[PDB]
Every structure is written in structure tokens, then in C-alpha cells.
Design a binder for this molecule. Structure first.
Ligand SMILES: Cc1cc2nc3c(=O)[nH]c(=O)nc-3n(C[C@H](O)[C@H](O)[C@H](O)COP(=O)(O)OP(=O)(O)OC[C@H]3O[C@@H](n4cnc5c(N)ncnc54)[C@H](O)[C@@H]3O)c2cc1C
Ligand SMILES: Cc1cc2nc3c(=O)[nH]c(=O)nc-3n(C[C@H](O)[C@H](O)[C@H](O)COP(=O)(O)OP(=O)(O)OC[C@H]3O[C@@H](n4cnc5c(N)ncnc54)[C@H](O)[C@@H]3O)c2cc1C
Ligand SMILES: CC[C@@H](C)Oc1cc(N)nc(Sc2cccc(Cl)c2)n1
Ligand SMILES: CC[C@@H](C)Oc1cc(N)nc(Sc2cccc(Cl)c2)n1
Ligand SMILES: CC[C@@H](C)Oc1cc(N)nc(Sc2cccc(Cl)c2)n1
Ligand SMILES: CC[C@@H](C)Oc1cc(N)nc(Sc2cccc(Cl)c2)n1
Ligand SMILES: CC[C@@H](C)Oc1cc(N)nc(Sc2cccc(Cl)c2)n1
Ligand SMILES: CC[C@@H](C)Oc1cc(N)nc(Sc2cccc(Cl)c2)n1
Ligand SMILES: CC[C@@H](C)Oc1cc(N)nc(Sc2cccc(Cl)c2)n1
Lengths: 486, 487
């Protein structure tokens, strides 16, 4: 070859590694993977494995499974599990500790992958494009810093992911993000989760589980109803159920000023003009793509909306040899997608047989308490897009919650079909095991299954999922975008 | 002509569904016979069927109770500190809280018959007089007082099934699923006999509710528990019951039982061991419940232990008489009996005929941990289809590194036909396996292929996302022979 390495991957991400690994193993290419550190934690947070492994899907989910024990301990008494309810409070310390261990052992698990894989090489620093075939690595985030390596390559892949959006407000410095939340010293007593994204909610769940006895948690959204882009009816039942679990949801209310107090605590001036004191305050505003210092303009790769790399369906950028995936594109900011985008890139480029990722009918989930599983069109956007649609609903309280005493925990299902053909466009579920159920739904919808296939499949009694196969007569319809009965 | 357009013998999961549908969607005059209105002994079964009163409902509640044992224990790893000295639960407050819940269904159902015109409940022992008549009697003695005499166009037999006993000296001193539900106290020293889904579910329950110092033994005459399930699933489970403290015992059934001076039950074994247990449950299985209906009076046929002889549209030996659910002995699940009984209503009363699809029925075992399975076992698949490919994947969920239950391996095993890529079977052991499998059994109802499975996008992080990563078979079968690659 004319060059040194075949591939370079900026960012050792869920998407990045998958690509880098596959190219190196199934195609034996020489592949380098750049990231900013090897083990998780501050100051950089993200590390080997990506945002999902170090400060996302893994640690998050562990804490969520921790926070659930609050309910499950409480629920147990109804089935005759008697015990000391005076020791009401958990230990945040022993959770974070136990979490770190687990996340850490992945970073180990990955180091020895690069060691064990020939072709694959990890390169710790800040990746930056020199030109279309060269990638500078630097020790410091300052672009003028010491230059650590200079990688030469046929193809470049940008899997640098995304970074928390701040709100530019007086006192922003004193707030935290998803990233900092994971390495908090102690459990916040008086907590304020700002925003209404899936992060905002997941975390409100977590802190509400791990609050010290006497603490409370406030959610705070500028809009009307939390989690836009989800089935409104699901969003409401959830907004209630967070309430029922003790999360004080607050709407049409964002803060305007934050000021640190003489005892360390954070004082918050609000939208309406309220003043309040919280130990911590987290910003789940969202995530901007992480392209802001890579020097894309040096190479001729294009930025669009907040650095979103400009990319076609086969993941190719402005420059022919350069590609980009996952969160930096801003197509869909989930891992399984980024993995697939990065797998498809390897078959396209190195594997001969080209292919692009199918972004329709991607199932996904929110690990709130209780959690949501959704795949497909929201009923609002479905009736607007397709001419005639039929909306099926079903809410039931599981039989067990008569005994557990959590009668607030309504399991909900909402199927949204095209009426003409009977095809399932969307399925929306709130309740425990909704993330597990939905996956297998998203397979049915990948085939484009119809409501006939759903109800006319035999049941698995007793489950929550068996109420997919009973959904027969629509609760109501839409006729040309018009909320209709007939 | 007739005073009822249909009589149901047995207010069952299948029965009610049929009786309700005929009465409501078709406005027929329908009577439903059962032996009582509320749950409990001596009869156990009541309004709602075996599932509602002494099956899927109470069982599942107890299972959800028994889980709390693990979940309490597991919580400590995530920093849930508390008094572990009070190690033991309260069986009494569980049974109590269970009864309430099952009871409120029996209420829920009484007022259905009240609120539904056409629908009428008739408490007694149903018995065929002839092809159009159904005698109701107060006592189980066939010669007893005659309470009603129902006349009808069509008769449906949804009388379900009854626990198989083992004819052994001391059988009287044992219990069944039915009695288990109304036990006074939690058995300390317990012996679950057999290796059916009941046997296992219950071993799970008693092991959760044992007093501190008690133990639970499982006991099967065969090699490996739960025949008819994926062998590799059956083993990982047999280990995991062990790991939870259930002492599994194989090639060992008892031969004599004798009650002791302090009430307890003493058990002579297959191998010749002697042991003492507080209670001993028999999950041998369930024979159809046709043994006193006088089918021979009407000309309906019995076969293997009363199994009603029935065609695909659920029609029996006599044209106007039909039978469903457990009494047929096709598949002894509720969702099936419901569908068999729904299909019967469209066939007879609804004009448009239809028969129930017994292939690719998903189902589950609520062990701890539970199984979800739909389709062919790998053994029977390779024997039946020429070339098959078996995909496997066992992982330990990320959380069990912290909870300290590292024994809890979530397992998945897909079994395909290799020629076409079609998914014949899917087998899952682990928490949320029953919820996941339902949505699988929809894919397999369409006859989905392994291409559709792996090439669907993931829902990270779940157990179910490891269905959409299953790409290269661990091994194959070529004309019934265990092999890696072919020809
Ligand atoms: C709190 C949180 C929770 C989440 N939860 C879920 C969930 O439950 N389910 C789900 O499906 N998805 C979840 N996600 C989404 C998931 O993390 C991402 O969508 C996915 O990892 C995107 O892949 P990517 O390769 O584009 O970025 P990532 O996989 O995140 O890779 C980013 C990597 O690039 C490196 N990098 C960035 N810039 C540079 C540079 N200049 N030089 C060198 N290296 C660099 C970083 O150090 C990092 O390791 C979550 C995200 C967050 C933040
Ligand atoms: C412990 C246990 C657990 C179970 N768990 C599950 C599970 O988790 N999932 C699942 O799918 N299935 C389960 N089953 C199976 C389920 O209970 C039955 O297979 C199902 O209810 C069959 O429906 P059916 O209408 O045929 O009969 P059933 O619903 O069993 O109907 C029986 C009814 O008929 C009545 N009857 C009996 N004799 C007469 C007569 N001579 N005259 C009038 N009425 C009569 C009885 O009083 C009874 O109420 C379980 C069974 C048991 C015993
Ligand atoms: C009931 C709807 C009626 C009050 O109209 C509403 C309601 C609402 N919450 N926000 C608006 S406009 C709006 C948009 C973004 C942020 C905020 Cl605080 C308000 N209009
Ligand atoms: C202009 C708003 C900008 C600073 O970003 C913000 C501000 C805010 N209060 N909440 C969010 S999160 C958010 C709020 C409403 C709807 C949706 Cl979809 C997201 N983003
Ligand atoms: C097909 C679902 C339908 C039976 O509704 C449900 C769901 C559920 N979890 N429990 C019940 S109570 C119930 C009534 C009759 C038979 C059985 Cl097995 C259960 N009904
Ligand atoms: C109880 C009658 C005896 C002869 O037969 C037994 C004995 C026993 N321990 N378990 C059962 S139930 C059972 C045993 C093996 C395979 C299967 Cl599929 C079921 N039947
Ligand atoms: C392949 C091992 C070889 C001994 O075959 C085996 C093993 C076993 N446990 N039981 C049998 S026959 C058998 C069937 C029912 C009950 C009993 Cl105790 C034995 N054959
Ligand atoms: C046979 C492969 C099986 C063990 O899967 C593996 C392999 C491995 N090295 N780490 C894991 S850890 C893990 C944690 C949560 C979910 C899943 Cl699917 C896996 N699983
Ligand atoms: C792609 C492997 C995937 C299907 O298995 C799983 C499942 C799970 N719950 N956690 C993991 S750990 C992990 C490995 C790579 C990227 C990410 Cl985001 C997580 N792997």
C-alpha cells in the first residue's frame, strides 16, 4: 500500500470499536483507534468503550436496578416479607463503589482485546484531522499542544459521539450533567433534574431511589409534557407515576439564575420567580455532537447543525475516504444504531458488499421507574403522515399490585396501525418488562407485521405481553389527520 | 325448541370464554355449570376454572412472593442495608393476601352472570343424560338429588383436568397442587415429587417461604427434569435450582409413606433411603376430568384416561356435542383452551368455521429463574427436519456482578431449519423470558427466519437484544446427526 494503516477511528465508541474490531478481524486490515483515555472517570468521563460503556447504558442501568430495590423492598411486605423499615435509606457510596469496579473491569476487558488482537492498536490522546489521510494525536485539548503521534491512513472514521448541552445562564458553572452525576460523592438530598429528555427522567428515578431519608427530587421542564417524541398517553401515565413514586414533576418552568451558598448548597431562581435550595442540580438538556475541535474544515468534511457531520446513507462524508457514525451524525443517538452504522461501514468499504443502516422501526427504551418500550410511529405523526389510522389501547393493573399495594403501576400498551392495510406502524408500552418485550416486537415490525398477526397469535399466560395478542377492536381512529370515531 | 342454545359443563378459562361469547356476540341462551362459585376446598376449582382458582393466578402471586427472597438478598450489593436476622417470611400473610385477590375474581364473575342476559350460572355436578339434556346434581354420587335438568341444542365439555395420583402405600398422606394453595403453614422440610412444570414452580415457592432452618427436595423418576424442553435449558435450570438451595434428586421416586406420632410424614424411597418431611406434594401430572360425566350415556368417546375424542374443530363423537382445553389433552394451557373455546363459537354460532392452531404456541415455566419457550426442541427438530442449525448464547447479566447472584445465567437457544433459514424453535432461561417469548411466538406465527432476527436493530441494554446478535450456529444436525459443517 501507499500508506501506513488501512483505517483510523477517532473515538473508541460503541460504533467505533465495532467498526475497528470488524475491519481488523473479519478483514485483517491495519486499524488504529484513538480515544482520550483507557479507564472511565473524570475529567474526560468518556473512555475505551464509548459514552455507553463508561458514562451511559452500563453504569446508568446498574443505578436504575439499584433504585428499583426501593420499590421492591417496600412491595415485598404485602407478600409477607417482614423486616426493619426504620433503616429506610440506602448507601450511595457502596453503589458507586460497586459500579466503578464493574465499569472498570470492562476497561480492562478492552485493553487486553487490543493486546490480543493483531491489526488493532489503541492510541491515547486527542484525535484531530491534519488532512484527508492523516490524523494528528495530541496530549492536550489545546490544539497547539505537544503532538504525540501522526497516523497515516487510507480511510478515517469519526465515532466521537456527543457532549452534554449546557444552558447559557448565570450560574451554569455550579450545575452538573449526566457525566458528573456518575461520580458524585454523596447522594443528593434535595435534588433538581432539569429538562425532560430520557436522561432527565432516568436520573430523576435514580436519585429518588438513593435520596437520604428526608430528601426529595424535583423534575423541571420548559415544555408542557415531558419526553416529546413519545406516545402522549404513555407520557402522561408516566408523568403521573413519577409523581406517585415521589418525584415532584414541574412544567413550564426553567431556571434563570444559580448562586452557590455559604454552606456549599445551590440556590436557584426560577422561570416563574420562585427561589429554592437544592444540594445538586443536573442538566439533561440534551447532547450536541462532538466535532467542535477535530478540525474538519482542515480536511473538507462538513458541519451542519451544532457540528452534526454531514453524511449520506452509507455513512460517507463530504470527503470520499472519510466516514462518520453514531451520535456525531445526529441521525439516531442510540448505541445499537451506532454499532449497526459502524458494522455497515465495514461491509461497505472493506467487505465489498455495500449496505446502509435501516433507521425506520428501530426499537428503543427509557429506563424510568416504570420504564417505557416503544417502536415505530407516534399516533400523532402517524395520522398526519398516513391517511387513515386506527389506534388500539389497553391499560391494566397487574394482578400482583393488588397485594404489593403499588396500585398506581398501570401497565399500558398502545398499537397504532394503518387502517387500509392493517399494518402495525407503532407500538408503545409503559410498564415493567416493557424494554424486554418491545425488542421482539421490533422484529415483527421489521417484517411489517399486521394487527391480524398480533391478536391472532396464541397467548403466554400469565404475562403483560399476552395483552398484545388480545388487541382487536380500535378504541378510536384518525381519518386524514382528524381525531375520529368513524 | 330448546331452553338453552348451549350448556357448558365447567366454568373454565375455555368454558366461560365460549359461554360469554355465544351469549354476547351471538345473543344465544347459555348456561354454565360448575361445582362452586368461590375458590377453595373441598372442590378447589370454581367459577373461572382451574387457572383462576388453583393455577395461573394464585400460583403466580406466590412465585412473585418467593422471588422477593432473592431480590431482598440481591439488594445489599447495591447498598440496601438492613436487618438480615429477620430472614424469614410470613406464609400466613401471603395466603391471606392471595385469597382476598382470588376471591375478588369470583365476585367479579358472579356479577358478570348477573349483568349478562342469556348467561346463567348453575351450581352442581354436570352429567350427560343424553345428546341434548344435561342433568345437574348436588352430590358427586351420581344417584344423588337432582337439582336441575337443562335442555339444549349444543353441549360443550370444558371440565378440565385433575391431579394424577401415584398408587402407592401412603398416597393418602400426600398433597397436590390443589391442596398446596390452602396449606396452613409453610412446610419446613418439603418434598416436591415429579418433574413437571408444577413440580418445579412449587419447589421455587416453598423454597422462598421455608422457615429459617428448612429445606426443599425435588424428586424425579427420570434423569433430567422437565422433559419436552431444551435439554441445555433443562440442565442450566437444574443447576440454578441447586444454586438457590433446592436439592434436586433424580432416578428416585418414593415407595411407601407413613404418618408419624408428631404428625410429620416419613418417606421410604426408591433407593431405600428413609427421610422425614412436613409435607409432600405430587406434581405427577393431570388426567382429564371426564370420569363421572356419563359420556357413554350420550355416545361421546373416551380414549386415554378419559381424553375426550375430538376433531380439529373441537367436535366430539356426537355432532351437537363439543369439548375443549384440558379434557381433550391436546395442549393443557389456558390461552389454548380460551382459543379452542373462542373458535367453537365462530364455528357453531358464528357461521364462519375455524380450528385452533396448536403449532408455535408460546408458553412459560415460572420457576426461579423462569423459562420461556416456543417451537421445536433441538432433538425433535433434527429428527423431523433433515438439516438443522442450532444457535446458542449464554451470558451473565451485568447486574449480577454486583448483586452477587453470579449463578444466574440468561440463556437463549434458537433452532432453525438450515435449508430455508426458518426459525423452528426458540428457548430461553432467565428473568423476563416469559415476557420476551410472547413477542417471539408472533414472529414464529409468521414463520420468521434467522435473517429477520439478527438483522433487526437492538434495544440496548436488555436480555432480549441478544436475539438480534445470533448469527453463526454453534453446531448443526445433518439428517439427525450432531455435526459442525456439512457434506
Ligand atoms: C447518560 C447516557 C445514557 C445512555 N443510555 C443509553 C441507553 O440506555 N440505551 C441506548 O441504546 N443508548 C444509550 N446512550 C447512547 C449511547 O451512549 C450512544 O448513542 C453511542 O455510544 C454512540 O456511539 P458513537 O460511537 O457515536 O459515540 P460513543 O460510542 O459514545 O464514543 C465516543 C468516544 O469517542 C471519544 N472521543 C470523542 N472525542 C474525541 C477526540 N477529540 N479524540 C479522541 N477521542 C475522542 C470519547 O472519549 C468516547 O470514548 C446513552 C448515552 C448517555 C450519554
Ligand atoms: C397449579 C396449576 C398451575 C397452572 N398454571 C398455568 C400457567 O401458568 N399458564 C397456563 O397457561 N396454564 C396453567 N394451568 C393450566 C390451566 O389451569 C388449565 O389448563 C386451563 O384452565 C384449562 O381450561 P379449561 O376451560 O379446559 O378447563 P378449566 O379452566 O380447568 O375448567 C375447570 C372447571 O370445570 C369445572 N367442572 C369440573 N367437573 C365438572 C362437572 N362435572 N360439571 C360441571 N363443571 C365441572 C370445575 O369446577 C372447574 O371450575 C395450570 C394448572 C394448574 C393445576
Ligand atoms: C393548554 C395549552 C396552552 C396553555 O398553551 C400553552 C401551554 C404551554 N405549556 N406552553 C405554551 S407556549 C410555551 C412553549 C415553550 C415553553 C413555554 Cl414555558 C411555553 N402554550
Ligand atoms: C432554547 C432552549 C435551549 C437552551 O435548550 C433547552 C432548554 C430547556 N429549558 N430544555 C431543554 S430540553 C427540552 C425541552 C423541551 C422540549 C424538548 Cl424535546 C427538550 N433544552
Ligand atoms: C388473554 C388475557 C386475559 C385472560 O386477561 C387476563 C390477564 C391476566 N393476567 N389475568 C386474568 S384473570 C384470569 C381469568 C380467566 C382465566 C385466567 Cl388463566 C386468568 N385475565
Ligand atoms: C406417579 C406415577 C409414576 C408411575 O410415574 C411418574 C413418577 C414420577 N416421579 N413423575 C411422573 S411425572 C413425569 C415423569 C417423567 C417424565 C414426565 Cl414427561 C413426567 N410420573
Ligand atoms: C445414559 C445413561 C443410562 C444409565 O440410561 C439411563 C439412565 C437413567 N437415569 N435411567 C434410565 S431408565 C429409567 C427410566 C425411568 C426411571 C428410571 Cl429410575 C430409570 N436409563
Ligand atoms: C458466550 C458469550 C457470553 C458469555 O456473552 C458474554 C461474553 C462476555 N465476554 N461478556 C459478557 S458480559 C454481558 C453483560 C450484560 C449483557 C450481556 Cl449480553 C453480556 N457476555
Ligand atoms: C453488542 C453486544 C451486546 C449485544 O451485548 C451486550 C449487552 C449488554 N447489556 N451489555 C454489553 S456490554 C457492552 C459492550 C459493547 C458496547 C456496549 Cl454499549 C455495551 N453487551
Amino acid at each position: 500500500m501507499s500508506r501506513a494503516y488501512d483505517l483510523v477511528v477517532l473515538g473508541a465508541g460503541s460504533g467505533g470499536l465495532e467498526a475497528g474490531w470488524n475491519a481488523a478481524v473479519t478483514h485483517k486490515k491495519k486499524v488504529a483507534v484513538v480515544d482520550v483515555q483507557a479507564t472511565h472517570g473524570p475529567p474526560l468521563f468518556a473512555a475505551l468503550g464509548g459514552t455507553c460503556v463508561n458514562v451511559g447504558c452500563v453504569p446508568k442501568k446498574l443505578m436504575v436496578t439499584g433504585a428499583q430495590y426501593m420499590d421492591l423492598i417496600r412491595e415485598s411486605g404485602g407478600f409477607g416479607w417482614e423486616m426493619d423499615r426504620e433503616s429506610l435509606c440506602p448507601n450511595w457510596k457502596t453503589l458507586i463503589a460497586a459500579k466503578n469496579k464493574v465499569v472498570n473491569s470492562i476497561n480492562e476487558s478492552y485493553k487486553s482485546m487490543f493486546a490480543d488482537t493483531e491489526g488493532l492498536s489503541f492510541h491515547m490522546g486527542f484525535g484531530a484531522l491534519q488532512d484527508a489521510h492523516t490524523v494528528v494525536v495530541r496530549k492536550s485539548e489545546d490544539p497547539h499542544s505537544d503532538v504525540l503521534e501522526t497516523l497515516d491512513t487510507e480511510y478515517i472514521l469519526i465515532a466521537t459521539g456527543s457532549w452534554p448541552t449546557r444552558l447559557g445562564v448565570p450560574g451554569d458553572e455550579f450545575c452538573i450533567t449526566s457525566n458528573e452525576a456518575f461520580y458524585l460523592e454523596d447522594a443528593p438530598k434535595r435534588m433538581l433534574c432539569v429538562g425532560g429528555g430520557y436522561i432527565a427522567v432516568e436520573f430523576a428515578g435514580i436519585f429518588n431511589g438513593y435520596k437520604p431519608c428526608g430528601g426529595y427530587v424535583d423534575l423541571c421542564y420548559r415544555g408542557d409534557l415531558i419526553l416529546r417524541g413519545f406516545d402522549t398517553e404513555v407520557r402522561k401515565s408516566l408523568t403521573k407515576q413519577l409523581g406517585a413514586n415521589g418525584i415532584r414533576v414541574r412544567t413550564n418552568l426553567n431556571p434563570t439564575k444559580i448562586t452557590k451558598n455559604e454552606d456549599g448548597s445551590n440556590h436557584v431562581h426560577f422561570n416563574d420567580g420562585t427561589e429554592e435550595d437544592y444540594d445538586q442540580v443536573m442538566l439533561a438538556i440534551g447532547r450536541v455532537p462532538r466535532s467542535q475541535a477535530l478540525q474538519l474544515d482542515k480536511a473538507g468534511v462538513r458541519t451542519g447543525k451544532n457540528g452534526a457531520v454531514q453524511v449520506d446513507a452509507y455513512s460517507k462524508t463530504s470527503v470520499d475516504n472519510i466516514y462518520a457514525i453514531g451520535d456525531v451524525t445526529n441521525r439516531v443517538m442510540l448505541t445499537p444504531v451506532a454499532i449497526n452504522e459502524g458494522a455497515a461501514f465495514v461491509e461497505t468499504v472493506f467487505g465489498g458488499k455495500p449496505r446502509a443502516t435501516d433507521h425506520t422501526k428501530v426499537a428503543c427504551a427509557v429506563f424510568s421507574i416504570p420504564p417505557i418500550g416503544t417502536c415505530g410511529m407516534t399516533e400523532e405523526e402517524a395520522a398526519k403522515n398516513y391517511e387513515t389510522v386506527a389506534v388500539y389501547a389497553s391499560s391494566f393493573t397487574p394482578l400482583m399490585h393488588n397485594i404489593s399495594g403499588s396500585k398506581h403501576k398501570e401497565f399500558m400498551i398502545r398499537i397504532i396501525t394503518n387502517e387500509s392495510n392493517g399494518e402495525v406502524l407503532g407500538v408503545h408500552m409503559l410498564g415493567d418488562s416493557a424494554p424486554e418485550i418491545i425488542q421482539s416486537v421490533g422484529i415483527c415490525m421489521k417484517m411489517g407485521a399486521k394487527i391480524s398477526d398480533f391478536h391472532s397469535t396464541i397467548g403466554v399466560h400469565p404475562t403483560s405481553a399476552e395483552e398484545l395478542c388480545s388487541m382487536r377492536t380500535p378504541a378510536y381512529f384518525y381519518e386524514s389527520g382528524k381525531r375520529v370515531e368513524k
